[PDB]
Design a protein around this nucleic acid. Structure first.
Ligand SMILES: [Mg+2]
Ligand SMILES: [Mg+2]
Ligand SMILES: [Mg+2]
Ligand SMILES: [Mg+2]
Lengths: 58, 852
RNA sequence: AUACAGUGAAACUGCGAAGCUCAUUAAAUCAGUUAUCGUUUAUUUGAUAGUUACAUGGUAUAACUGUGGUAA
RNA sequence: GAUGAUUCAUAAUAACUUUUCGAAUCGCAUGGCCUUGUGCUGGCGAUGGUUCAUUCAAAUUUCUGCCCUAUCAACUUUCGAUGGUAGGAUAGUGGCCUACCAUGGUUUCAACGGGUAACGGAGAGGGAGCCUGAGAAACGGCUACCACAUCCAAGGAAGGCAGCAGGCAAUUACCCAAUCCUAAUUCAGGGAGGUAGUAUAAAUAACGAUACAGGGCCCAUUCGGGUCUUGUAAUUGGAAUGAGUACAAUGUAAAUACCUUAACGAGGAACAAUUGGAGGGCAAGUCUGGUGCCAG
């Protein structure tokens, strides 16, 4: 039944309507702003103990 | 009703439209309840999707059982008890009961290799292994969904720490699980990956943060569809080409048909493809093409007949496309051997004229005298010398998989191809047949497991020249930073894996997890001299085995599961039953890799020499914070070495490898009798004792091995060349030279022992041969005993022989090879060998007379 | 209730579990009747056994505790 | 001693036995004594146990008992047919079975066979074998064989539904109370059992008043004849009650139903039964044939 609600999932137009310490960690995850990809950009890596921090490959 | 985030449906819809796969990570106890919803969204987007679902778990299912009758009884009792209404079934049970779900343990992941499934579920995140992850994802068709359930509290806590700050790693109270940690970061890079909670809230950490619904709706199909109409009249080509799924596959079949048409028996066709690109389907179709063309004697060879099931299945589909009917045009013969599990061995065809398709073991090359066509499926897994023999005066089809199953290193295929340069025809299949080319998931998968790594020639070395080995310096590699997924580390990890895969013969995908997680393992790199990312020249992997590992083992047994194994400590234990060597801490060189093109420049030997110095002490906390990263490479001085007694190696015995280790002062201690099935090579263990350490036990081990080798040359090592056996003896004797002590020394044969070994008549018989009054065949009796005494060194300095003569005596006495067989091996005329053989025995007679 | 003592899941013991559908068969079915000095008989009813002991053993286990295999 | 009758009952001797049994049990009460020790001696029941008899049954067994039959005259020894001896087995008698011995038994007074409104004995997927109990060759269980068929990760597992009930479509819901039955039993249960579910007598009306009209009806082919309180397509009054709308009690294991019973319940009594038949008549209407205005 496409139009009707089967199980708990209902589809109208292009939007779908579904019926539904961990909580503190979960809501913390939901609120993170930066992407993982962006976070690498600020991080520089040292090849050697006293070497310069290299950020991006040449 | 809660409005679901528009990102989740847009991802599934986009994947179906583009036939790209999508990864969903569900975090929460109720994660299972969301799977029915995701399945419904997948189907509603397109009704052409495959409905089968793959469920993978480790030991237990999450709160249910896959036995229909058992669930029904529990439901019926609950209904009778009144706990549940008569006809109520919440969505999860309805999803399991109706849908076609295949429940598979992680251990038996080999069963699912052939099949294809619409959706994949991986129940347990912690137990994930590279092989289980590559095998399962490859079975998801385009537009399918891969679901991973991170339900464990610790896994969530790892997810929490990693997202808030990337550098920090959550480490509980010896397995580090770096692969799972490195795995999580790789998802953030993936554009088709969403990480979600049990409430269907999109956690922002995922890479698919900005997915937008694509507008409503390829060139490859157009280039494929058109080719099919143009050949529809041309039977048998039209029916067979119709089965092709991709442009590359059709070209391969047409090229195979072309070779079948030429009818010339001196050509080789080499098919190279990635796994799942349809190599077996193309070969099976071509075998059907050769059947209709008229070929009578068609052969198929593979390491086992069981692997050929897919090939045989497509042959029948080719036969069906050609109108052949079972039990009328062809008959199927299955194996009676229980080991092959009723695998198809032979198909006899009765149309027009009698034609036969049959499976042959690769070793049985003698029967190929009348062969018209042999199909070598998975030639990578067959030993090279056997493959050489199989290349006879007939049409040859070779199928080799690159980075599939165990397969082989890419260079070994190049070493195969360069040998062919017999006219050679090369075909490559690139397009995958289960999904769109360039799927982000596949590119994601290859990056994570480092499968598609290719070695690259460095122009900078050419401009500056190859560094002299003395200039190079060995640097320790910090594993934590290497598997941190920083772009520099990923590129360096990319380069290290290239040397790994290229050189050695077989590498399983689990090897990456073994390197990252195992605590005993350490990594060393022979970087070029410092003056850009440094590119390695030689990489060594060490595994600390001995008394040091007992603490880890005791902890593992406390957990209730022994971890890993100590090969050399145990191997020596059964052979010699030496209690001391078990307590002796030592290191095992798991693998040494060098650039093949820079082979013979001594980089490998240089790396070992520096490695030996480091553990000797001649060069005398960087763990990631546990709830800014440490340097990637550590100089030897910066880290203190462990206290070690010996360095051990384990490898398949080959002349090049044995010579390499022999030059590095290693001593053989054991040589396995049963050759390894994949390679045909015998596993050999060699040990090296460091200075400042007691060396008596090694010498006793070496002497015992030499005696065992001499007696065992007849049983299973008769295949070894006489030079090879002589060299292995020589290396062991070098261990005696290591000991300047004279406490142990070889003993010269007495008169009494000589009398017992040889009766007086035998001495007369030997003397007559020296004087030429006697034939050779009568003295066959004394040769093996003479060889035992000579290589036992009982004669001593009185009798000595050249290298060629020693090979001759070793062959007849110990290998039991005939004289004429020796003539071929040593490239000598048969008459010459007998003359040299007589010269040896005259020296033998003179010594005995001198003793008398 | 200083052996337990009310009630009592589980388990061991004890007792009892003894309408339909097809075929067909002339005093071999069946009804009445005789005998059991030719028999078995749970149960009910009446009679009936003078020929370490201030209480023996696990030669004993369930239920129960706990560790696991399996798709079941 | 008993019976009509006994080697029957019963007693004794000599032995035998995979020699049986002759309370190592439980509840309630705590009396009588004294030799004060918790010393001796105890009341009411239950559950057990040997033998005999009785009862409930079961198994064999004596004799009698309405079809047509000869166009059914021989049947039985046809792997016992008829009898004796001995043994095996049964709970026992016995050709019930076995070894030896005799060659018999039924019948024209109808053996044997045939037909029958002789509904006027068998099994639980199909044959074979076995197990429990006082009672079974068990609608229970097990083994093998033969077929049917289900689940599966294809390594195995399990079933008797190869059933039942329907059509050519609702068999369900409430109970052990009433009569009976089983049990460690007054109390538990019983799809035994019970309860419910889905051609026949009435009504659609009865009784008055007023007003206004002169025709109404019957017979007869014909012409005509015969007889008198009739018609309304008029107005109007107060009484009667049933279907229904329904408060109760009684009822029943409870409940439906039956019986009984407050209030309301009629003029279009619209609180609006039908079925069939025979005749008319009408237009600025339609069609057809003609000898105007007609005929169909
Ligand atoms: Mg009695
Ligand atoms: Mg007798
Ligand atoms: Mg009136
Ligand atoms: Mg009516």
């Amino acid at each position: 039944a496409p139009m009707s609600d089967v199980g708990g999932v209902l589809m109208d137009k292009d939007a779908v309507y579904i019926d539904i310490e961990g909580e503190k960690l979960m809501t913390g995850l939901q609120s993170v702003e930066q992407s993982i990809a962006e976070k690498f950009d600020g991080v520089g890596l040292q090849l050697f103990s006293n070497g310069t921090e290299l950020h991006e490959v040449a | 009703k809660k409005a679901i985030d528009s990102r989740i449906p847009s991802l599934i819809r986009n994947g179906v439209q583009t036939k790209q796969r999508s990864i969903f990570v569900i975090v929460g106890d109720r994660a299972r309840n969301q799977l029915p919803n995701l399945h419904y969204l997948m189907m509603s987007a397109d009704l052409k999707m495959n409905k089968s679902v793959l469920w993978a778990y480790k030991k237990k299912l999450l709160g249910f059982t896959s036995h229909r009758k058992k669930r029904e009884n529990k439901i019926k009792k609950e209904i009778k008890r009144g706990t549940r209404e008569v006809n109520e079934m919440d969505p999860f049970e309805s999803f399991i009961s109706n849908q076609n779900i295949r429940y598979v343990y992680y251990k038996e992941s080999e069963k699912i290799l052939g099949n294809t499934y619409g959706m994949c579920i991986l129940q347990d995140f912690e137990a994930l292994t590279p092989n289980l992850l590559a095998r399962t994802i490859e079975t998801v068709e385009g537009g399918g969904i891969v679901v991973i359930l991170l339900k464990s509290m610790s896994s969530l806590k790892q997810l929490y720490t990693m997202t808030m700050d990337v550098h920090a790693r959550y480490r509980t109270e010896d397995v580090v699980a770096r692969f799972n940690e490195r795995f999580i970061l790789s998802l953030g890079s993936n554009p088709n990956c969403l990480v979600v909670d049990d409430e269907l809230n999109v956690l922002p950490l995922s890479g698919a943060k900005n997915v937008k619904p694509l507008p409503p709706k390829p060139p490859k199909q157009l280039e494929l569809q058109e080719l099919k109409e143009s050949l529809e009249d041309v039977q048998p080509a039209g029916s067979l080409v119709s089965l092709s799924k991709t442009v590359n596959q059709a070209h391969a079949i047409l090229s195979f048909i072309d070779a079948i048409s030429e009818k010339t028996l001196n050509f080789t066709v080499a098919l190279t493809a990635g796994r799942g690109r349809g190599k077996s389907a193309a070969l099976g179709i071509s075998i059907a093409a050769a059947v209709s063309h008229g070929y009578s004697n068609i052969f198929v060879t593979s390491p086992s007949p069981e692997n050929l099931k897919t090939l045989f299945e497509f042959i029948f589909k080719g036969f069906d496309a050609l109108g052949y009917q079972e039990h009328i045009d062809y008959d199927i013969i299955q194996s009676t051997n229980p080991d092959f599990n009723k695998a198809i061995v032979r198909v006899d065809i009765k149309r027009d004229h009698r034609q036969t398709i049959q499976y042959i073991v690769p070793q049985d090359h003698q029967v190929l005298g009348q062969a018209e066509l042999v199909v070598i499926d998975e030639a990578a897994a067959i030993p090279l010398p056997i493959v050489k023999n199989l290349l006879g005066p007939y049409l040859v089809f070779m199928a080799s998989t690159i980075n599939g199953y165990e397969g082989t290193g890419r260079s070994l295929s190049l070493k195969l191809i360069q040998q062919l340069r017999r006219q050679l025809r090369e075909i490559s299949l690139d397009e995958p047949i289960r999904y769109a080319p360039g799927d982000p998931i596949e590119k994601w998968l290859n990056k994570l497991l480092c499968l598609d790594v290719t070695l690259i020639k460095n122009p900078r070395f050419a401009t500056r020249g190859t560094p002299h080995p003395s200039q190079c310096n060995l640097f320790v590699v910090n594993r934590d930073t290497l598997f941190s997924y920083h772009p520099v580390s990923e590129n360096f990890l990319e380069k290290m894996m290239a040397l790994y895969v290229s050189s050695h013969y077989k590498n399983s995908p689990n090897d990456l997890q073994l390197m990252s997680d195992a605590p005993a393992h350490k990594l060393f790199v022979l970087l070029p001299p410092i003056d850009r990312i440094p590119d390695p020249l030689c990489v060594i992997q060490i595994a600390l085995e001995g008394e040091i590992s007992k603490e880890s083992v005791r902890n593992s047994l406390s957990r209730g599961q022994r971890a890993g194994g100590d090969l050399i400590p145990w191997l020596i234990s059964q052979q010699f039953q030496d209690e001391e060597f078990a307590s002796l801490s030592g290191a095992r060189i798991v693998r040494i890799a060098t650039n093949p093109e820079y082979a013979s420049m001594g980089y490998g030997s240089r790396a070992i020499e520096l490695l030996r110095d480091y553990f000797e002490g001649k060069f005398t906390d960087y763990s990631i914070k546990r709830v800014t990263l440490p340097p990637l490479l550590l100089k030897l001085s910066e880290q203190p070495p462990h206290y070690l007694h010996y360095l051990g190696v384990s490898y398949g015995l080959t002349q090049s490898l044995h010579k390499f280790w022999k030059n590095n002062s290693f001593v053989p201690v054991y040589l396995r009798q049963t050759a390894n099935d994949l390679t045909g090579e015998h596993t050999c263990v060699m040990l090296n004792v460091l200075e400042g350490r007691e060396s008596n036990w090694l010498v006793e081990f070496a002497k015992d091995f030499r005696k065992r080798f001499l007696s065992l040359l007849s049983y299973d090592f008769h295949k070894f060349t006489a030079v090879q056996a002589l060299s292995v003896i020589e290396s062991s004797k070098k261990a005696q030279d290591l000991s300047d002590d004279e406490k142990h020394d070889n003993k010269e044969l007495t008169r009494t022992h000589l009398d017992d070994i040889f009766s007086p008549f035998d001495l007369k018989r030997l003397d007559s041969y020296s004087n030429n009054l006697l034939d050779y065949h009568v003295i066959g009796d004394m040769i093996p005993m003479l060889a035992l005494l000579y290589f036992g060194d009982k004669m001593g300095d009185s009798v000595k022989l050249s290298s060629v003569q020693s090979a001759i005596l070793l062959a007849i006495g110990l290998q039991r090879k005939n004289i004429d067989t020796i003539a071929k091996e040593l490239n000598l005329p048969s008459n010459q060998t007998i003359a040299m053989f007589a010269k040896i025995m005259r020296k033998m007679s003179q010594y005995f007379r001198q003793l008398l």
